[PDB]
Write a protein that binds this ligand. Sequence first.
Ligand SMILES: *C[S@@+](CC[C@H](N)C(=O)[O-])C[C@H]1O[C@@H](n2cnc3c(N)ncnc32)[C@H](O)[C@@H]1O
Length: 327
Amino acid sequence: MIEIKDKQLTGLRFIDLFAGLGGFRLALESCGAECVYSNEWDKYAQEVYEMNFGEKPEGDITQVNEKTIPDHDILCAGFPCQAFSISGKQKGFEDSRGTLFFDIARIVREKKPKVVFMENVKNFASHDNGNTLEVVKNTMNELDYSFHAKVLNALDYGIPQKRERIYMICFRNDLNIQNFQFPKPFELNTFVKDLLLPDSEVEHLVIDRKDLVMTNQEIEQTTPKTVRLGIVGKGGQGERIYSTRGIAITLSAYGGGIFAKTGGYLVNGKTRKLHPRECARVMGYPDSYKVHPSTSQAYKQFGNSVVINVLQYIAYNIGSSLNFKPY
DNA sequence: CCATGCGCTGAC
DNA sequence: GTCAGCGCATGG
Ligand SMILES: *C[S@@+](CC[C@H](N)C(=O)[O-])C[C@H]1O[C@@H](n2cnc3c(N)ncnc32)[C@H](O)[C@@H]1O
């Protein structure tokens, strides 16, 4: 994450829905805001959350009475994406995991917060010939809110990872906000090679296979893109090997293959996958965050999360707009 | 719960 | 024609 000197969100309160590891919480707290409610139903995720923030989140949002939720200024939500991802079956609103958006709407109707901040995958903007996004935009308009949305790539904000996502920002109409803007991209200067741990600590992740087929030579200069060097098996998800002089492929939660969820890399002459701590680093988390003792739950949690740095820039811009009040 | 072989879609 | 994907399916 980045250091913020000008704390634009001092005095404001927020709630953390579909909490996970708390990526939305780290970002907003660094800007000066205070968290007054959290919700998440997974046993293992509630354990890391409590380990790091000192509180246990509430369970199943579909059966929580929206009137019991505390007053707040900003609602945060990185809702489920299996029903919209290009890697799944694309069932959309027909999917039992695809209706969570209407629960958010239910809460927004009652509490009427100043800002709604949401995140989902890139395919969300294209799904069902554009109907899915129009449905979300019209619902927010009907509740008396404006709608701003755009797809941003993590590699343009200083983190070496190809992770394209859609961010949706909404302001209550009586506030009359007319100067909000998404942050501007800058040049990348850090690469996969600069975030790795010492060879001694990662010996156990090395994989030596006999069907390894190199198809490209190692590159001699760094570059802001994914560079594939070789393959194992039939070359499907989890069987592709990349260079550490380039950037990392997007991390997943339920992925398979011998190099599952992280992908494989050529390091000092050997091929291996990433360690949980290196996953924390490519997601923008500080070395002081404590990970789950179970390696299996840790990879799943990081693959479902958000890049901290990108949210910090967006949150600062939300505060700047709220504070501009001339006579 | 955990590990790993798959097979199709979207955007070039 | 080439390449990537906060995923699915089945074995123990
Ligand atoms: C995909 S993920 C959010 C990650 C988070 N932004 C981060 O780690 O920083 C979605 C999370 O939502 C939880 N979830 C799914 N359905 C429910 C219901 N109905 N009630 C509560 N929580 C739910 C998932 O377990 C996941 O962690």
